[PDB]
Design an enzyme around this catalytic site. Structure first.
Site, PDB file in Angstrom:
ATOM      1  N   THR A 119      57.397  31.952  37.064  1.00  0.00           N
ATOM      2  CA  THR A 119      57.745  33.218  36.673  1.00  0.00           C
ATOM      3  C   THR A 119      58.689  32.923  35.403  1.00  0.00           C
ATOM      4  OG1 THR A 119      57.589  34.027  38.911  1.00  0.00           O
ATOM      5  CG2 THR A 119      58.965  35.348  37.314  1.00  0.00           C
ATOM      6  N   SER A 123      48.552  30.664  44.529  1.00  0.00           N
ATOM      7  CA  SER A 123      47.152  29.914  44.449  1.00  0.00           C
ATOM      8  C   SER A 123      46.860  28.920  45.085  1.00  0.00           C
ATOM      9  CB  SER A 123      46.794  29.887  42.899  1.00  0.00           C
ATOM     10  OG  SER A 123      47.301  30.731  42.217  1.00  0.00           O
TER      11      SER A 123
END
Ligand SMILES: Nc1ncnc2c1ncn2[C@@H]1O[C@H](COP(=O)(O)OP(=O)(O)NP(=O)(O)O)[C@@H](O)[C@H]1O
Ligand SMILES: Nc1ncnc2c1ncn2[C@@H]1O[C@H](COP(=O)(O)OP(=O)(O)NP(=O)(O)O)[C@@H](O)[C@H]1O
Ligand SMILES: Nc1ncnc2c1ncn2[C@@H]1O[C@H](COP(=O)(O)OS(=O)(=O)O)[C@@H](O)[C@H]1O
Ligand SMILES: Nc1ncnc2c1ncn2[C@@H]1O[C@H](COP(=O)(O)OS(=O)(=O)O)[C@@H](O)[C@H]1O
Ligand SMILES: C[As](C)(=O)[O-]
Ligand SMILES: [Mg+2]
Ligand SMILES: [Mg+2]
Ligand code: NA
Lengths: 173, 173
Positions: free
Chosen positions: A16, A83
């Protein structure tokens, strides 16, 4: 012009943080882009999903779905999501084509001493089960397009690496 | 020139049909666009959802989320979904801004007569509960941007109405 830039890594590795920086740098220069952060779309597009293998697969695939549509209409997509499964990542890459895998790589020990949101301690206490890298897998990209080692690198270098790939691959001026 | 064209109406009203025709016409003129049909998104993007009020609001909002990203990035988005609840339609409208609400208005009797998918028979028998217009609400648009009475029109006239409202509102030359 359109590409999906896909940032995978451990929680707290720095997806992020990088995505916001990269985002700002691209927009200032006037590029058009959208961002899909895992934490945030889970309140939106993927509301109601948890963290089982089936639910992470739904999450990532759904994200891939929206990235695919934007990318093929000329939009830089900034994705940041754990992921954890390599085959799912590979699947999404195949689907979008114009795809840069970015391995945001911090050793687990670093991610954990960082404990940005207190999650890791909760994972060790047993409070949270199936936390990625603690008792749920994380499959490292064996051949990623960029690797940002964020114990070693400063934010500007980590962004610089990605920015530079975009230039080499002629996705930006 | 990005915009969301939102077709709402009963099952069998003619949204999906209008959408392909409006699609091919726009696509031939060289415009770039994306189609989000209620039938189709419910096999990927909104797989798992039903037709309770709750689940329809989820479905519409998620469709809306995707349209909004594509719209503010210059894309023409064709949505055809029943969109039974008005306050939810209005919400998506204010959120996206560049928004055409197209009321595909066919009376329920005409729609039941065609019964394209055999579904009304199933609603009447009770095999399918909570079918729109038989056992669940449909709140018609009060001030839609365009209204297609498909009972009293042919495709080209219905498709034609939209296409020109599009050129009035200057979305396409
Ligand atoms: N390149 C970098 N070098 C050094 N520290 C960094 C770097 N990038 C991020 N950090 C720091 O390490 C932490 C990473 O935060 P964050 O971006 O939230 O990780 P994350 O992968 O997004 N966790 P999450 O989004 O919840 O899965 C922050 O405290 C940053 O200050
Ligand atoms: N103006 C019209 N007049 C007469 N028949 C029409 C008209 N427009 C469409 N049709 C016919 O309507 C039938 C199917 O309608 P359809 O487009 O599938 O409605 P729908 O409610 O949007 N389906 P769905 O997207 O699943 O809810 C086809 O056989 C079309 O030929
Ligand atoms: N069991 C968990 N494993 C990993 N992250 C979790 C877990 N529970 C809550 N979270 C939070 O959810 C975020 C991860 O969401 P995603 O990136 O969307 O995960 S992913 O595996 O499906 O890609 C983490 O940043 C973390 O804050
Ligand atoms: N209970 C139901 N009500 C309406 N449509 C149904 C129902 N069950 C199955 N369907 C099918 O689902 C389609 C409607 O899906 P949507 O357009 O996505 O509905 S919406 O209300 O959530 O907007 C219809 O075309 C119909 O074929
Ligand atoms: C047919 As019923 C469950 O709406 O009474
Ligand atoms: Mg984050
Ligand atoms: Mg249809
Ligand atoms: Na560092």
């Amino acid at each position: 012009r359109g590409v999906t830039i896909w940032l995978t890594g451990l929680s707290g590795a720095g997806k992020t943080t990088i995505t916001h920086a990269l985002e700002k740098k691209l927009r200032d220069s006037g590029y058009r882009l959208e961002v899909l952060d895992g934490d945030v779309v889970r309140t939106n597009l993927t509301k109601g999903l948890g963290f089982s293998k089936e639910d992470r697969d739904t999450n990532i695939r759904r994200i891939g779905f929206v990235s695919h549509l934007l990318t093929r209409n000329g939009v830089i997509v900034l994705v940041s999501a754990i992921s954890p499964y390599a085959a799912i990542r590979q699947e999404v890459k195949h689907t979008i084509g114009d795809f840069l895998e970015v391995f945001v790589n911090a050793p687990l020990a670093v991610c954990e001493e960082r404990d940005v949101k207190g999650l890791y301690a909760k994972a060790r206490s047993g409070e949270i089960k199936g936390f990625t890298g603690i008792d749920d897998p994380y499959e490292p990209p064996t051949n990623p397009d960029v690797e940002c080692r964020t114990d070693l690198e400063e934010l500007d270098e980590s962004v610089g690496k990605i920015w530079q790939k975009l230039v080499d691959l002629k996705y930006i001026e």
